[PDB]
Amino acid sequence: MYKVGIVLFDDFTDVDFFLMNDLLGRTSDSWTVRILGTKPEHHSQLGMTVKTDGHVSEVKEQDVVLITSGYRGIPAALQDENFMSALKLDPSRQLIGSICAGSFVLHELGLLKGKKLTTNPDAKAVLQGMGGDVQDLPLVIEGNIATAGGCLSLLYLVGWLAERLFDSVKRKQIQNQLIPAGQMEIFETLISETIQSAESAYEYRSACESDAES
């Protein structure tokens, strides 16, 4: 059983959080999910209250760390030195992911220096100005780090976790509980291809790096 930590903060976007949490909860034999924050409770943009299971520092203990999003929440988090200093992430030993403006955090931690990433389309120009090499793609994989852009790209991000840790059967089991009735095959084509295309781009970039190193 893998340990998954979801990193939370005040004014997180409700739909991203609940969808992320719901997808991960669609399997009961894969992972244990803990909500990590800086306070006993955090509030969403709509004022929903979520209790934390532990401190942000506990990302150190996780097999998977996921950063959620928030229009006002993310900029506030970036300005919080204790939040940022707790997030000591190690891609050699952890899968690390983000949704929407969550990639701002991964960028500002230095985890994607010289690498590609994505975010929600409305946030792209700002992330570019912060030095992000932002692509107009739903999922961008760089080794054991993946960033996802636009809320529904959570299907790709969680599917990537399932593919990396388990297999396609697990992936399908999870996604099938959220997808539209009668469209299982349409969404399987979409999800499998989107993830595979992201892996293909990554392996190209890795190959170039190896070529350059040699």
178 touches a copy of itself by CB under 8 A:
yes
Name which of residues 34 to 63 contact a copy of itself (CB under 8 A). Answer: 46, 48-50
Tokens of 40: 């006993």
Tokens of 118: 């994505």
Residues of the chain with a following break (C to N over 2.5 Å): none
How many Å from the N-terminal Cα to the C-terminal Cα in the chain?
A: 38
- Least Å distance between CB 128 and a copy of itself? 13
Strand partners for 114: none
150 touches a copy of itself by CB under 8 A:
yes
185 touches a copy of itself by CB under 8 A:
no
Q: Which of 6, 153, 170, 174 binds a copy of itself (CB under 8 A)?
A: 153
Distance CA 67, CA 19 (A): 13
Q: Which of 18, 71, 83, 166 binds a copy of itself (CB under 8 A)?
A: 18
186 touches a copy of itself by CB under 8 A:
yes
Cβ burial of 79 (10 Å; 0-12, 13-18, 19+) is exposed
Per CB under 8 A, residues contacting a copy of itself are 14-15, 18-19, 21-22, 46, 48-50, 118-122, 124, 135-139, 148-153, 156, 176-183, 186, 190, 194
